[PDB]
Amino acid sequence: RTRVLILGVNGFIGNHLTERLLREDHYEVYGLDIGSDAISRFLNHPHFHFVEGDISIHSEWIEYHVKKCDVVLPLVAIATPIEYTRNPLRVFELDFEENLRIIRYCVKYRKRIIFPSTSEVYGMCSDKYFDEDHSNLIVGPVNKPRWIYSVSKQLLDRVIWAYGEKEGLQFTLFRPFNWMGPRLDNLNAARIGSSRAITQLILNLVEGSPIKLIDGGKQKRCFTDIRDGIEALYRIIENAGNRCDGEIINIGNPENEASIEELGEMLLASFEKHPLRHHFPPFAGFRVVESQDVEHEKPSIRNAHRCLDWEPKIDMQETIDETLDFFLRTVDLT
Numbered sequence: 001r002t003r004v005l006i007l008g009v010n011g012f013i014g015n016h017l018t019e020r021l022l023r024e025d026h027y028e029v030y031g032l033d034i035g036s037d038a039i040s041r042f043l044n045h046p047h048f049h050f051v052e053g054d055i056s057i058h059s060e061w062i063e064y065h066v067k068k069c070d071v072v073l074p075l076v077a078i079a080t081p082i083e084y085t086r087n088p089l090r091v092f093e094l095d096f097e098e099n100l101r102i103i104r105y106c107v108k109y110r111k112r113i114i115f116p117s118t119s120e121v122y123g124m125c126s127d128k129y130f131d132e133d134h135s136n137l138i139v140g141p142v143n144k145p146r147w148i149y150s151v152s153k154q155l156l157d158r159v160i161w162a163y164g165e166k167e168g169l170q171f172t173l174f175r176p177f178n179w180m181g182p183r184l185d186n187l188n189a190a191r192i193g194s195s196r197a198i199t200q201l202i203l204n205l206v207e208g209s210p211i212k213l214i215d216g217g218k219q220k221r222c223f224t225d226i227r228d229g230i231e232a233l234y235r236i237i238e239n240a241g242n243r244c245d246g247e248i249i250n251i252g253n254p255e256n257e258a259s260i261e262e263l264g265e266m267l268l269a270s271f272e273k274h275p276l277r278h279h280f281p282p283f284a285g286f287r288v289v290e291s292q293d294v295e296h297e298k299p300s301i302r303n304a305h306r307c308l309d310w311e312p313k314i315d316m317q318e319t320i321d322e323t324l325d326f327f328l329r330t331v332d333l334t
Contacts (some may be wrong), residue, residue: 001026001047004237005065007055007102008075011185012193013116016230017073018042030069032062038183055098056116066105071112071237074102078190079118084149090298094190096152103160107169114236116174116192117157117248119297120150129300132175132248144292157248164246172244176298177252180319181226182326187298197221201264202327205271208281217261220296224253225322235308241266243307250299253312256319257298261286272323276328284322 004021006014009031015038021027022045031039032051042048044315053061055076066072084091106113122130124138137154139147163169178195185194187203204211232251236244258266268283304310 001028003028003069005069005072006031008191009033010035013193015039015183016226020234063105067109073114075192077192088148107163107167112170115173118153119174119177121154121177130301140292173248175250176183178223179226179229181324201267210284210287211264212287213261215290218259221260222252222298223256225319228312232310249303252299254298256316264318270324
């Protein structure tokens with residue numbers, strides 16, 4: 001069986017991916033993290049092995065697990081907008097420098113790396129559909145520090161591409177577009193995965209604070225149910241016919257497009273009709289705020305079509321209802 005090393009397994013993607021791989025009987029999962037509360041259900045599974053670790057502290061212990069395994073999925077990164085500007089240097093050191101160390105262990109021991117790039121690399125790209133192979137990448141002047149995350153991730157993609165081109169690194173990059181479903185990552189957990197925007201909104205409803213609409217909340221986004229997203233990630237790991245080698249693949253549902261405002265209204269509506277609504281405060285309402293932005297973020301999914309024979313199935317309403325439902329029933333009221 002194939003050994004899958006998941007760095008930063010204690011969260012949204014690690015939970016769903018692990019459940020997926022373990023349902024099949026030809027995988028061995030090694031989940032590395034500093035905690036295990038998010039995947040405790042798997043600690044006793046015969047084919048899951050928790051590994052104590054931190055990519056900023058451990059060097060050797062991680063290198064060892066890269067040599068021991070077959071496929072590597074590094075999910076540790078700080079991807080919360082306020083941080084790009086609040087603690088830029090840490091975002092850079094963790095997201096760029098520490099992950100570069102892991103990319104290098106992979107080329108050194110000739111292992112396969114499945115790397116989470118980001119939908120933010122496209123920046124202010126004018127294409128209606130962001131294309132992994134044709135769209136230009138657009139960011140603002142260096143005096144707009146918000147772009148440091150975007151560019152750091154883009155540079156890593158290029159370094160990976162160079163290793164694959166000059167040193168035989170076998171890799172696949174994937175770019176998730178607002179994945180959502182049960183077991184969302186904490187708003188400030190340094191793990192790549194769940195949509196921060198929908199997480200923030202649900203928190204607004206749960207805590208009784210207002211839903212802020214930056215300049216009207218007109219910017220559009222696409223949302224993907226984790227059942228669809230993880231199926232695609234799963235197929236990248238399978239890599240049938242080796243079709244994913246050297247590929248960059250957007251993973252999103254371009255049909256589930258909505259403005260921040262409409263998404264807010266959809267969650268509210270689903271929220272108002274929920275059986276546990278009374279355990280939460282009254283809706284505080286929509287606050288129009290006004291403070292560099294991205295006005296649209298829709299993916300082209302031709303590569304996912306080609307390399308994975310994948311098409312997203314769950315409609316917007318289903319994703320919304322299920323994500324909110326699991327969240328509300330999981331909250332500790334006391």
